[PDB]
Amino acid sequence: AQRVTFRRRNPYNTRSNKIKVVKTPGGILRAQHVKKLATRPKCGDCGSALQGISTLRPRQYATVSKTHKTVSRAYGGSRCANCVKERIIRAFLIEEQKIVKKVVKEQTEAAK
Template sequence: MFRTASVAKQFSRTMSSKVIPVISKNAPPAAASYSHAIRANGFVYVSGQIPYTPDGKPVEGDIKAKADQVLKNALAIVEDSNSKLENIVKVNIFLKDMGNFAKFNEVYSTYFNAHKPARSCVAVAELPLGVDLETPGGKLVAQHLKKKATRPKCGDCGVALPGIATLRPRAYASISKTHKTVSRAYGGSRCANCVKERIVRAFLIEEQKVVKKVLKEAAAKDKSKK
């Protein structure tokens, strides 16, 4: 397979991004060797959930009770991954009996009412531990909420510095020095008003020193005349 330089560069950057496993205390323990979720490339990939409580006990009752527990487990993992229901983009559902489709949807619609992500629902012959359903069925994708970037602030008054890019700290390491400051004294750490105040203050201090020196010299001359 051939790739252009730009595609190869993008592929390399994607593969080298950080992969962070998520283990939630608000979902049942993993039944095998897997994480509750994986955060990568700005997305959260949630493992399939079955109708078990966070303390590892199976849920008894009809398909509605089981569906409710499964969705609670999945959404708890999403929240523990620093995301939320409104960011979910795709849900896969496995049902052992399609006769439960309507009842499952009754519960599902109470969670996904205003926000309706893309969805697939299929019937399967068997599910882990003999349960009736599993969701997200191997793939519930939720966008990861990244922290908002903030512009550097003036060290004196705390006002955001104009003319400087608004980026996360790691991003500042990859930009040129000209984008981290502006062309004036204290350009990257103080705003124009505070720089002006510093200049005026420095001028007044120097002027005060000159006045003291002149007064001292005048006093010395008067003393010598006497």
């Protein structure tokens, strides 16, 4: 039933300073400031959370290996699997349509 308060300069209940109450090895209750939770990286096309990539603070990514923040597939770590599949299919079909349109133009200009 012991009351605890902030341990830093800020006296206001702002998002920046949030308090948890913990029992120290001295048998007493004491406050502890909690950091902001990390946010999962999101896909750049659909905005869904990327799978297989660890969730860390922006500056904590500078200290981990590349396998913990990428995926072995192309666009891995930036776009998800379904978006890459759509990109591949769309690019191939667009190229095929360009070929067909070029053949049609060649035929229609071949009359004269």
